[PDB]
PDB file of all heavy atoms in Angstrom:
ATOM      1  N   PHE A   1      91.957  90.851 116.505  1.00 13.68           N
ATOM      2  CA  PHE A   1      93.021  89.944 116.917  1.00 13.68           C
ATOM      3  C   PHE A   1      92.518  88.875 117.872  1.00 13.68           C
ATOM      4  O   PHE A   1      92.724  87.674 117.623  1.00 13.68           O
ATOM      5  CB  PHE A   1      94.164  90.704 117.590  1.00 13.68           C
ATOM      6  CG  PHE A   1      94.882  91.652 116.680  1.00 13.68           C
ATOM      7  CD1 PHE A   1      95.700  92.635 117.208  1.00 13.68           C
ATOM      8  CD2 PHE A   1      94.705  91.592 115.286  1.00 13.68           C
ATOM      9  CE1 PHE A   1      96.347  93.543 116.398  1.00 13.68           C
ATOM     10  CE2 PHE A   1      95.340  92.504 114.439  1.00 13.68           C
ATOM     11  CZ  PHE A   1      96.188  93.473 115.002  1.00 13.68           C
ATOM     12  N   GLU A   2      91.853  89.299 118.947  1.00 16.80           N
ATOM     13  CA  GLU A   2      91.312  88.347 119.897  1.00 16.80           C
ATOM     14  C   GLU A   2      90.305  87.417 119.239  1.00 16.80           C
ATOM     15  O   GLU A   2      90.329  86.202 119.455  1.00 16.80           O
ATOM     16  CB  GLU A   2      90.670  89.031 121.097  1.00 16.80           C
ATOM     17  CG  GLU A   2      91.602  89.948 121.930  1.00 16.80           C
ATOM     18  CD  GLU A   2      90.822  90.670 123.040  1.00 16.80           C
ATOM     19  OE1 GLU A   2      89.563  90.592 123.037  1.00 16.80           O
ATOM     20  OE2 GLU A   2      91.441  91.304 123.920  1.00 16.80           O
ATOM     21  N   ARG A   3      89.421  87.971 118.427  1.00 15.34           N
ATOM     22  CA  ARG A   3      88.335  87.184 117.896  1.00 15.34           C
ATOM     23  C   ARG A   3      88.882  86.187 116.866  1.00 15.34           C
ATOM     24  O   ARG A   3      88.415  85.045 116.768  1.00 15.34           O
ATOM     25  CB  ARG A   3      87.227  88.102 117.359  1.00 15.34           C
ATOM     26  CG  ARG A   3      86.487  88.805 118.507  1.00 15.34           C
ATOM     27  CD  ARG A   3      85.721  90.013 118.066  1.00 15.34           C
ATOM     28  NE  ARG A   3      84.763  89.677 117.023  1.00 15.34           N
ATOM     29  CZ  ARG A   3      84.011  90.543 116.354  1.00 15.34           C
ATOM     30  NH1 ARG A   3      84.059  91.844 116.609  1.00 15.34           N
ATOM     31  NH2 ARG A   3      83.196  90.085 115.412  1.00 15.34           N
ATOM     32  N   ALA A   4      89.882  86.604 116.120  1.00 15.28           N
ATOM     33  CA  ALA A   4      90.503  85.712 115.192  1.00 15.28           C
ATOM     34  C   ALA A   4      91.234  84.614 115.954  1.00 15.28           C
ATOM     35  O   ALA A   4      91.140  83.441 115.607  1.00 15.28           O
ATOM     36  CB  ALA A   4      91.465  86.486 114.305  1.00 15.28           C
ATOM     37  N   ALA A   5      91.958  85.005 117.001  1.00 13.73           N
ATOM     38  CA  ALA A   5      92.754  84.083 117.808  1.00 13.73           C
ATOM     39  C   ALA A   5      91.892  83.023 118.492  1.00 13.73           C
ATOM     40  O   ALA A   5      92.333  81.920 118.723  1.00 13.73           O
ATOM     41  CB  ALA A   5      93.549  84.849 118.848  1.00 13.73           C
ATOM     42  N   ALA A   6      90.656  83.351 118.798  1.00 13.58           N
ATOM     43  CA  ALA A   6      89.762  82.371 119.348  1.00 13.58           C
ATOM     44  C   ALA A   6      89.331  81.268 118.344  1.00 13.58           C
ATOM     45  O   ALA A   6      88.780  80.257 118.776  1.00 13.58           O
ATOM     46  CB  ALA A   6      88.538  83.061 119.974  1.00 13.58           C
ATOM     47  N   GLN A   7      89.531  81.441 117.033  1.00  8.78           N
ATOM     48  CA  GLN A   7      88.968  80.456 116.090  1.00  8.78           C
ATOM     49  C   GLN A   7      89.998  79.767 115.168  1.00  8.78           C
ATOM     50  O   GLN A   7      89.687  78.781 114.522  1.00  8.78           O
ATOM     51  CB  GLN A   7      87.839  81.054 115.246  1.00  8.78           C
ATOM     52  CG  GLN A   7      86.729  81.754 115.981  1.00  8.78           C
ATOM     53  CD  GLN A   7      85.860  80.860 116.903  1.00  8.78           C
ATOM     54  OE1 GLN A   7      85.724  79.636 116.698  1.00  8.78           O
ATOM     55  NE2 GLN A   7      85.252  81.493 117.934  1.00  8.78           N
ATOM     56  N   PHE A   8      91.212  80.292 115.089  1.00  8.86           N
ATOM     57  CA  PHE A   8      92.242  79.646 114.273  1.00  8.86           C
ATOM     58  C   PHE A   8      93.362  79.149 115.168  1.00  8.86           C
ATOM     59  O   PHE A   8      93.543  79.679 116.291  1.00  8.86           O
ATOM     60  CB  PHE A   8      92.769  80.616 113.216  1.00  8.86           C
ATOM     61  CG  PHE A   8      91.758  80.966 112.201  1.00  8.86           C
ATOM     62  CD1 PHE A   8      90.882  82.037 112.409  1.00  8.86           C
ATOM     63  CD2 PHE A   8      91.625  80.204 111.054  1.00  8.86           C
ATOM     64  CE1 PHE A   8      89.911  82.368 111.473  1.00  8.86           C
ATOM     65  CE2 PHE A   8      90.638  80.502 110.121  1.00  8.86           C
ATOM     66  CZ  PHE A   8      89.769  81.602 110.336  1.00  8.86           C
ATOM     67  N   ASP A   9      94.109  78.147 114.697  1.00  9.41           N
ATOM     68  CA  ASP A   9      95.270  77.634 115.464  1.00  9.41           C
ATOM     69  C   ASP A   9      96.308  78.689 115.637  1.00  9.41           C
ATOM     70  O   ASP A   9      96.729  78.932 116.744  1.00  9.41           O
ATOM     71  CB  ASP A   9      95.897  76.355 114.880  1.00  9.41           C
ATOM     72  CG  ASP A   9      94.962  75.171 114.956  1.00  9.41           C
ATOM     73  OD1 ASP A   9      94.359  74.956 116.042  1.00  9.41           O
ATOM     74  OD2 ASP A   9      94.803  74.467 113.921  1.00  9.41           O
ATOM     75  N   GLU A  10      96.716  79.315 114.544  1.00  9.01           N
ATOM     76  CA  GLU A  10      97.604  80.461 114.648  1.00  9.01           C
ATOM     77  C   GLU A  10      96.982  81.678 113.961  1.00  9.01           C
ATOM     78  O   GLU A  10      96.171  81.531 113.039  1.00  9.01           O
ATOM     79  CB  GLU A  10      98.983  80.159 114.054  1.00  9.01           C
ATOM     80  CG  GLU A  10      99.817  79.185 114.860  1.00  9.01           C
ATOM     81  CD  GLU A  10     101.151  78.815 114.172  1.00  9.01           C
ATOM     82  OE1 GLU A  10     101.202  78.815 112.910  1.00  9.01           O
ATOM     83  OE2 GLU A  10     102.149  78.524 114.902  1.00  9.01           O
ATOM     84  N   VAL A  11      97.357  82.871 114.431  1.00 10.05           N
ATOM     85  CA  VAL A  11      97.065  84.105 113.719  1.00 10.05           C
ATOM     86  C   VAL A  11      98.377  84.859 113.503  1.00 10.05           C
ATOM     87  O   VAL A  11      99.189  84.927 114.403  1.00 10.05           O
ATOM     88  CB  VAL A  11      96.031  84.986 114.466  1.00 10.05           C
ATOM     89  CG1 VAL A  11      95.824  86.313 113.730  1.00 10.05           C
ATOM     90  CG2 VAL A  11      94.715  84.252 114.646  1.00 10.05           C
ATOM     91  N   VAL A  12      98.588  85.401 112.313  1.00 10.82           N
ATOM     92  CA  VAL A  12      99.768  86.219 112.048  1.00 10.82           C
ATOM     93  C   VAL A  12      99.370  87.686 111.721  1.00 10.82           C
ATOM     94  O   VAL A  12      98.871  87.967 110.637  1.00 10.82           O
ATOM     95  CB  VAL A  12     100.613  85.650 110.864  1.00 10.82           C
ATOM     96  CG1 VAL A  12     101.899  86.439 110.698  1.00 10.82           C
ATOM     97  CG2 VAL A  12     100.920  84.192 111.052  1.00 10.82           C
ATOM     98  N   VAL A  13      99.591  88.606 112.648  1.00  8.27           N
ATOM     99  CA  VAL A  13      99.362  90.009 112.354  1.00  8.27           C
ATOM    100  C   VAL A  13     100.441  90.469 111.366  1.00  8.27           C
ATOM    101  O   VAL A  13     101.640  90.431 111.662  1.00  8.27           O
ATOM    102  CB  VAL A  13      99.312  90.895 113.635  1.00  8.27           C
ATOM    103  CG1 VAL A  13      99.172  92.389 113.273  1.00  8.27           C
ATOM    104  CG2 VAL A  13      98.162  90.469 114.568  1.00  8.27           C
ATOM    105  N   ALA A  14     100.009  90.858 110.172  1.00  9.81           N
ATOM    106  CA  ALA A  14     100.948  91.304 109.146  1.00  9.81           C
ATOM    107  C   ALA A  14     100.911  92.819 108.971  1.00  9.81           C
ATOM    108  O   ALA A  14      99.919  93.407 108.541  1.00  9.81           O
ATOM    109  CB  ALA A  14     100.702  90.592 107.837  1.00  9.81           C
ATOM    110  N   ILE A  15     102.002  93.447 109.339  1.00 10.29           N
ATOM    111  CA  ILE A  15     102.117  94.871 109.228  1.00 10.29           C
ATOM    112  C   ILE A  15     102.679  95.224 107.863  1.00 10.29           C
ATOM    113  O   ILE A  15     103.858  95.024 107.609  1.00 10.29           O
ATOM    114  CB  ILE A  15     102.984  95.411 110.332  1.00 10.29           C
ATOM    115  CG1 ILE A  15     102.431  94.884 111.668  1.00 10.29           C
ATOM    116  CG2 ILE A  15     103.040  96.923 110.230  1.00 10.29           C
ATOM    117  CD1 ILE A  15     102.894  95.596 112.891  1.00 10.29           C
ATOM    118  N   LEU A  16     101.812  95.737 106.989  1.00 11.93           N
ATOM    119  CA  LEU A  16     102.181  96.061 105.614  1.00 11.93           C
ATOM    120  C   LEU A  16     102.846  97.398 105.408  1.00 11.93           C
ATOM    121  O   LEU A  16     102.365  98.418 105.872  1.00 11.93           O
ATOM    122  CB  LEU A  16     100.987  95.969 104.691  1.00 11.93           C
ATOM    123  CG  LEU A  16     100.690  94.511 104.407  1.00 11.93           C
ATOM    124  CD1 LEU A  16      99.203  94.392 104.174  1.00 11.93           C
ATOM    125  CD2 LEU A  16     101.534  93.985 103.217  1.00 11.93           C
ATOM    126  N   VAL A  17     103.959  97.357 104.684  1.00 10.19           N
ATOM    127  CA  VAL A  17     104.724  98.541 104.315  1.00 10.19           C
ATOM    128  C   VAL A  17     103.992  99.364 103.243  1.00 10.19           C
ATOM    129  O   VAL A  17     103.667  98.844 102.169  1.00 10.19           O
ATOM    130  CB  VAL A  17     106.090  98.115 103.735  1.00 10.19           C
ATOM    131  CG1 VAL A  17     106.969  99.324 103.491  1.00 10.19           C
ATOM    132  CG2 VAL A  17     106.777  97.117 104.662  1.00 10.19           C
ATOM    133  N   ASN A  18     103.710 100.633 103.509  1.00 11.52           N
ATOM    134  CA  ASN A  18     103.389 101.475 102.361  1.00 11.52           C
ATOM    135  C   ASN A  18     104.475 102.494 102.070  1.00 11.52           C
ATOM    136  O   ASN A  18     104.634 103.478 102.809  1.00 11.52           O
ATOM    137  CB  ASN A  18     101.994 102.115 102.374  1.00 11.52           C
ATOM    138  CG  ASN A  18     101.515 102.483 100.948  1.00 11.52           C
ATOM    139  OD1 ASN A  18     102.198 103.220 100.204  1.00 11.52           O
ATOM    140  ND2 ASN A  18     100.350 101.943 100.558  1.00 11.52           N
ATOM    141  N   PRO A  19     105.226 102.245 100.980  1.00 12.31           N
ATOM    142  CA  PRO A  19     106.358 103.092 100.577  1.00 12.31           C
ATOM    143  C   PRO A  19     105.896 104.477 100.068  1.00 12.31           C
ATOM    144  O   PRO A  19     106.665 105.440 100.108  1.00 12.31           O
ATOM    145  CB  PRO A  19     107.047 102.268  99.478  1.00 12.31           C
ATOM    146  CG  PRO A  19     105.945 101.327  98.929  1.00 12.31           C
ATOM    147  CD  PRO A  19     104.954 101.131 100.038  1.00 12.31           C
ATOM    148  N   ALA A  20     104.643 104.563  99.616  1.00 12.37           N
ATOM    149  CA  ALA A  20     104.026 105.836  99.216  1.00 12.37           C
ATOM    150  C   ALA A  20     103.564 106.677 100.427  1.00 12.37           C
ATOM    151  O   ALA A  20     103.868 107.877 100.516  1.00 12.37           O
ATOM    152  CB  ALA A  20     102.860 105.594  98.219  1.00 12.37           C
ATOM    153  N   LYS A  21     102.841 106.052 101.359  1.00 13.03           N
ATOM    154  CA  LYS A  21     102.252 106.783 102.495  1.00 13.03           C
ATOM    155  C   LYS A  21     103.151 106.728 103.721  1.00 13.03           C
ATOM    156  O   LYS A  21     103.270 105.684 104.371  1.00 13.03           O
ATOM    157  CB  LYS A  21     100.852 106.241 102.837  1.00 13.03           C
ATOM    158  CG  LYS A  21      99.958 107.200 103.644  1.00 13.03           C
ATOM    159  CD  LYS A  21      98.554 106.612 103.869  1.00 13.03           C
ATOM    160  CE  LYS A  21      97.982 105.942 102.603  1.00 13.03           C
ATOM    161  NZ  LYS A  21      97.921 106.856 101.406  1.00 13.03           N
ATOM    162  N   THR A  22     103.799 107.853 104.016  1.00 12.71           N
ATOM    163  CA  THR A  22     104.478 108.008 105.288  1.00 12.71           C
ATOM    164  C   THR A  22     103.403 108.141 106.373  1.00 12.71           C
ATOM    165  O   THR A  22     102.324 108.704 106.142  1.00 12.71           O
ATOM    166  CB  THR A  22     105.433 109.220 105.300  1.00 12.71           C
ATOM    167  OG1 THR A  22     106.157 109.241 106.541  1.00 12.71           O
ATOM    168  CG2 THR A  22     104.662 110.554 105.106  1.00 12.71           C
ATOM    169  N   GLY A  23     103.690 107.595 107.544  1.00 16.29           N
ATOM    170  CA  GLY A  23     102.707 107.564 108.603  1.00 16.29           C
ATOM    171  C   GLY A  23     103.298 107.965 109.935  1.00 16.29           C
ATOM    172  O   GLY A  23     104.454 108.353 110.020  1.00 16.29           O
ATOM    173  N   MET A  24     102.504 107.862 110.986  1.00 17.18           N
ATOM    174  CA  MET A  24     102.870 108.484 112.228  1.00 17.18           C
ATOM    175  C   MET A  24     104.017 107.736 112.919  1.00 17.18           C
ATOM    176  O   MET A  24     104.953 108.347 113.437  1.00 17.18           O
ATOM    177  CB  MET A  24     101.643 108.620 113.126  1.00 17.18           C
ATOM    178  CG  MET A  24     101.842 109.644 114.190  1.00 17.18           C
ATOM    179  SD  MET A  24     100.425 109.867 115.264  1.00 17.18           S
ATOM    180  CE  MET A  24     101.280 110.105 116.813  1.00 17.18           C
ATOM    181  N   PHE A  25     103.941 106.411 112.927  1.00 16.60           N
ATOM    182  CA  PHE A  25     104.961 105.590 113.577  1.00 16.60           C
ATOM    183  C   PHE A  25     105.749 104.768 112.550  1.00 16.60           C
ATOM    184  O   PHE A  25     105.281 104.544 111.410  1.00 16.60           O
ATOM    185  CB  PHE A  25     104.315 104.677 114.609  1.00 16.60           C
ATOM    186  CG  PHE A  25     103.598 105.404 115.724  1.00 16.60           C
ATOM    187  CD1 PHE A  25     102.254 105.755 115.598  1.00 16.60           C
ATOM    188  CD2 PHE A  25     104.259 105.691 116.922  1.00 16.60           C
ATOM    189  CE1 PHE A  25     101.586 106.394 116.647  1.00 16.60           C
ATOM    190  CE2 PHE A  25     103.619 106.343 117.978  1.00 16.60           C
ATOM    191  CZ  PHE A  25     102.284 106.697 117.848  1.00 16.60           C
ATOM    192  N   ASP A  26     106.962 104.352 112.897  1.00 20.90           N
ATOM    193  CA  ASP A  26     107.615 103.374 112.033  1.00 20.90           C
ATOM    194  C   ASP A  26     107.513 101.980 112.627  1.00 20.90           C
ATOM    195  O   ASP A  26     107.149 101.811 113.794  1.00 20.90           O
ATOM    196  CB  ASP A  26     109.051 103.747 111.628  1.00 20.90           C
ATOM    197  CG  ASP A  26     109.419 103.205 110.229  1.00 20.90           C
ATOM    198  OD1 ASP A  26     108.490 102.799 109.483  1.00 20.90           O
ATOM    199  OD2 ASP A  26     110.626 103.178 109.881  1.00 20.90           O
ATOM    200  N   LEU A  27     107.823 100.996 111.791  1.00 20.89           N
ATOM    201  CA  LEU A  27     107.610  99.580 112.082  1.00 20.89           C
ATOM    202  C   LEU A  27     107.978  99.174 113.488  1.00 20.89           C
ATOM    203  O   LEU A  27     107.171  98.544 114.178  1.00 20.89           O
ATOM    204  CB  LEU A  27     108.415  98.713 111.133  1.00 20.89           C
ATOM    205  CG  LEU A  27     108.040  98.697 109.672  1.00 20.89           C
ATOM    206  CD1 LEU A  27     109.059  97.848 108.919  1.00 20.89           C
ATOM    207  CD2 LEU A  27     106.625  98.129 109.543  1.00 20.89           C
ATOM    208  N   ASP A  28     109.181  99.511 113.928  1.00 23.34           N
ATOM    209  CA  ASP A  28     109.552  99.031 115.225  1.00 23.34           C
ATOM    210  C   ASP A  28     108.534  99.444 116.261  1.00 23.34           C
ATOM    211  O   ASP A  28     108.109  98.614 117.074  1.00 23.34           O
ATOM    212  CB  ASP A  28     110.981  99.424 115.600  1.00 23.34           C
ATOM    213  CG  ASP A  28     112.012  98.570 114.879  1.00 23.34           C
ATOM    214  OD1 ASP A  28     111.659  97.409 114.503  1.00 23.34           O
ATOM    215  OD2 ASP A  28     113.164  99.057 114.675  1.00 23.34           O
ATOM    216  N   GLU A  29     108.123 100.711 116.214  1.00 21.92           N
ATOM    217  CA  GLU A  29     107.120 101.222 117.141  1.00 21.92           C
ATOM    218  C   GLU A  29     105.784 100.492 116.902  1.00 21.92           C
ATOM    219  O   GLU A  29     105.095 100.087 117.858  1.00 21.92           O
ATOM    220  CB  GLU A  29     106.942 102.733 116.959  1.00 21.92           C
ATOM    221  CG  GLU A  29     107.922 103.668 117.679  1.00 21.92           C
ATOM    222  CD  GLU A  29     107.808 105.130 117.151  1.00 21.92           C
ATOM    223  OE1 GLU A  29     107.976 105.380 115.907  1.00 21.92           O
ATOM    224  OE2 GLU A  29     107.535 106.035 117.997  1.00 21.92           O
ATOM    225  N   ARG A  30     105.442 100.309 115.627  1.00 19.05           N
ATOM    226  CA  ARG A  30     104.223  99.592 115.259  1.00 19.05           C
ATOM    227  C   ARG A  30     104.192  98.174 115.846  1.00 19.05           C
ATOM    228  O   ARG A  30     103.289  97.845 116.660  1.00 19.05           O
ATOM    229  CB  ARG A  30     104.018  99.575 113.745  1.00 19.05           C
ATOM    230  CG  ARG A  30     103.587 100.907 113.154  1.00 19.05           C
ATOM    231  CD  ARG A  30     103.269 100.728 111.693  1.00 19.05           C
ATOM    232  NE  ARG A  30     103.510 101.916 110.884  1.00 19.05           N
ATOM    233  CZ  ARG A  30     103.047 102.069 109.645  1.00 19.05           C
ATOM    234  NH1 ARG A  30     102.309 101.108 109.091  1.00 19.05           N
ATOM    235  NH2 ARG A  30     103.299 103.177 108.956  1.00 19.05           N
TER     236      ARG A  30
END
């Protein structure tokens, strides 16, 4: 994140949904 942010005007962290793989946290927490 930091390293990308140093070289592009904007960076967008995209949190991808996996409907197959349940995981430890849900989006809001993520």
Side-chain angles (χ1 to χ4, degrees):
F1 295 164
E2 301 175 351
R3 289 161 57 186
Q7 308 295 334
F8 293 88
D9 294 313
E10 290 175 330
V11 176
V12 185
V13 176
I15 307 197
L16 283 150
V17 187
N18 203 304
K21 200 177 317 303
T22 185
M24 200 179 142
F25 299 89
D26 211 15
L27 293 175
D28 284 334
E29 276 167 303
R30 287 186 210 194

